[PDB]
């Protein structure tokens, strides 16, 4: 909001804008260290060893 005098309200001092995550509900650890990873499937008709 901003008046015609020039006094204004930014999203500073209303919010705390900073980058974070989508969903904080799932949390994973690997021997104490935080970790995420890919679960790789195999496409139909493909040799798995060289994949």
């Amino acid at each position: 909001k901003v008046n015609p005098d020039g006094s204004q309200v930014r999203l500073k001092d209303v919010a705390d804008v900073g980058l974070g995550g989508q969903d904080y509900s799932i949390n994973a650890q690997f021997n104490g260290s935080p970790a995420s990873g890919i679960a790789i499937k195999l496409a139909t008709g493909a040799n798995a060893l060289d994949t």
Partner: protein, 50 residues
Amino acid sequence: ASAETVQDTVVQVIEQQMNGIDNLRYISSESNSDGSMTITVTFEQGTDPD
């Protein structure tokens, strides 16, 4: 919108997901100026197109 916004907005993620289809040949794209956009994915022969 311009070409670079469409190219890093739509074509990135659709061409990202359109790998992993078995029996491909090459996945190519095109992002035009006037807001048009197309992706022509080409399969190897011996695949029923439906």
